[PDB]
Design a protein around this ligand. Sequence first.
Ligand code: HAS
Ligand code: HEM
Ligand code: CUA
Ligand SMILES: [Cu+2]
Ligand SMILES: [Xe]
Ligand SMILES: [Xe]
Ligand SMILES: [Xe]
Ligand SMILES: [Xe]
Ligand SMILES: [Xe]
Lengths: 166, 33, 557
Amino acid sequence: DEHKAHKAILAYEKGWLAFSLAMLFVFIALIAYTLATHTAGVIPAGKLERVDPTTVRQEGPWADPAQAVVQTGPNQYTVYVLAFAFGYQPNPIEVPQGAEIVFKITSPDVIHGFHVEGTNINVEVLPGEVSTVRYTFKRPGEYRIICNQYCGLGHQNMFGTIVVKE
Amino acid sequence: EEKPKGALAVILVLTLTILVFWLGVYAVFFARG
Amino acid sequence: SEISRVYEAYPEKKATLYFLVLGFLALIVGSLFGPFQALNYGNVDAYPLLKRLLPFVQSYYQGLTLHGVLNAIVFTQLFAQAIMVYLPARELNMRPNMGLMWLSWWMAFIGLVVAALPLLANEATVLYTFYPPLKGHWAFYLGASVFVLSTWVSIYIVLDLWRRWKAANPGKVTPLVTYMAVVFWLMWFLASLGLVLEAVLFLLPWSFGLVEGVDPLVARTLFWWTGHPIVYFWLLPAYAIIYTILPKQAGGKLVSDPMARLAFLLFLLLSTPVGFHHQFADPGIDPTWKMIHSVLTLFVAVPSLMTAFTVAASLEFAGRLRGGRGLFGWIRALPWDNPAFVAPVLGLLGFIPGGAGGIVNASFTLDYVVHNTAWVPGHFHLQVASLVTLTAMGSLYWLLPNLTGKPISDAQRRLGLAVVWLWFLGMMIMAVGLHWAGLLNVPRRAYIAQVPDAYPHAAVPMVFNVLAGIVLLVALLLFIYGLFSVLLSRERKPELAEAPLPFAEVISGPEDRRLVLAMDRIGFWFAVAAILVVLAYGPTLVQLFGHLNPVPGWRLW
Ligand code: HAS
Ligand code: HEM
Ligand code: CUA
Ligand SMILES: [Cu+2]
Ligand SMILES: [Xe]
Ligand SMILES: [Xe]
Ligand SMILES: [Xe]
Ligand SMILES: [Xe]
Ligand SMILES: [Xe]
């Protein structure tokens, strides 16, 4: 008693810790799996890509909204998105399906979020940096973009749109 | 007295809850892929 | 000029009380916005009512800034500074350097007020994360800095106690509570450097006018260096009470000293080098480094997993000592009439769905499902606003008497039990509501009641959020009532203000010595933790500091 409960507890503790680490390593193994698959495209690009925020929408790929989309391969399209104080340019973003869309997003003002409802596209958009993500939608129709980072008094109203064509 | 049946039940529930959460979202991650 | 002999040989008692009072006032004020926010996520706009009550409130987001700051930052730091200075001091029966201990309180008080002015005047509606380029008033940043630096005094205070005790007891193992306190404050010191650098290098010169740009990426990297460990800095003070006082309140004993020490040792090791789990959705950060940080974060869950077993066993043991039955008998044997027992127990229950939510968010790729949704607030209210606050609330039932001498009547005791159950229950409902809607893509930090038709698919969880909002509103009121009833009565027994803190017995074994001894090599372990931080952050920080891209400030409120 008490001393008898000490050893048993400490014994089952060691078996609990062995099981727990095992379970975590399994999780580490299924996360590594996702990294090797296609779904890993939503992980933003690692290399830094600096831009001037104060000069984004008057010069360079973000300046002209009719230019935002660009075919860069045979089945690759680069969209130059601009998340700003309560809105997204272009609106709506028009892209075909079965195509690899390479979003390159930045801000002229503050931090915004880029959350494409119904997809794994969830990226922070930082002023003076380009958030580069790759995504191939499989489902055709109405994709809404939500700003999930507080960016001012109109933040709850900051909605965007992805027009992806069947 | 003996085995912590009560404790091992508790961490069983905890273990089951973690899995439901992890596997459930692990699913939803691929469905939005 | 001293009216109570108590405060003259235990003057730490007084300094502890002030930290506690200031902390629960901030808790109350901050908590007022809670119910309104809950209704907001129940698609109900009650804010014109709030605006009529509190006429200085300008927006939802000013409210939300006050809610975060006053509850997550102020209440929690002042509770820590109270617990993780007073409990070691009483365990050792040593007086803490009172000159420095009062200085740390004044810092906290002047820092709070200084930062309170611009917040109350809507000059710093930037939330508790204050991300650049969102630019507040200088007096918020200055105020926050002073408030946070107060902890650096606290660290010194405890270290000092610890050195002095090592002197009087050469070659002896650091006693339990003190050991936790040490590895706690040391951990906090290492953690705090990320926020200090942010403040000193960027935010402070920026708000003062010295510079006109601040890089957002390095700003939120340094932030999250401190950003995560600070949650443990909220947590460990509750853990200390759960490990070393709860078993006594239950009627049993802490089943293991070395486990407790190992739990706290790991936290000192893994609490800091895991910030990238907050930045999974950030650009400019290498994906490999994100996977690294995701692994270490899975590891930092281990201490909690250990804790789960150690505490469960200690409450099964206590239950059996009370006349425990079979598989679930020990549960019913516990002192469910005692608020100091019930409150933390309930917090632990809800901590289970809270922890799993944490592990999910920590799975790199799976974050993209939940990041910045109502799921995250769902996650942490089970953690901070449940476990921590509840442990805090219930602990008033032994800690308030012990500092003041004021007894607690049966009525106030039963009042507590109501407030505790409601708070718990209400946090539970809310949890379901926020997780649900978070899966349905509902963003967090949003005044969604102002855009009613925006989220129709969240129909039924929006009901839960309304319910909780009502439930927790009532619990709060009863808390204020009950708390002020205890703080405004002149019933005083000076004898229970001299009664020892109900510390629990520690079951010890033979194997302990050698393991406990290696853990007491704190100077070694502190450097190990220091190196881990350099390795995890160093390579990235150096790459971000060579390519600085400061952007101008914005006010968007
Ligand atoms: C004080 C509160 C803090 C707790 C501690 C906490 C724990 C964790 N968190 Fe966290 N967290 C994250 C990962 C974790 C992980 C892995 C854990 C772990 O520490 C959890 C370990 C816990 C367990 C493994 C459970 C152990 C269970 C126990 C100990 C109870 C047993 C009960 C018993 C035995 C009682 C039985 C009694 C009877 C009577 C039977 C991640 C992802 O990696 C995000 C990012 C979301 C995003 O994208 O923004 C995050 C976001 C937050 C938010 C958002 C901050 C913001 O504004 O952006 C803050 C407040 C926060 C607080 C806290 N968090 N967390
Ligand atoms: C009185 C009971 C409480 C209720 C009903 C409540 C409700 C809420 C709600 C609905 C939100 C989401 C707001 C949004 O993201 O738009 C929230 C956020 C938050 N709550 Fe609570 N809360 C309560 C108590 C607490 C406590 C006790 C703490 C900490 C000790 C706390 C800390 C936080 C923090 C840090 C946030 C996020 C702030 C931000 O994202 O800017 N809350 N709360
Ligand atoms: Cu931009 Cu929310
Ligand atoms: Cu964290
Ligand atoms: Xe902070
Ligand atoms: Xe700060
Ligand atoms: Xe503050
Ligand atoms: Xe700071
Ligand atoms: Xe935080």
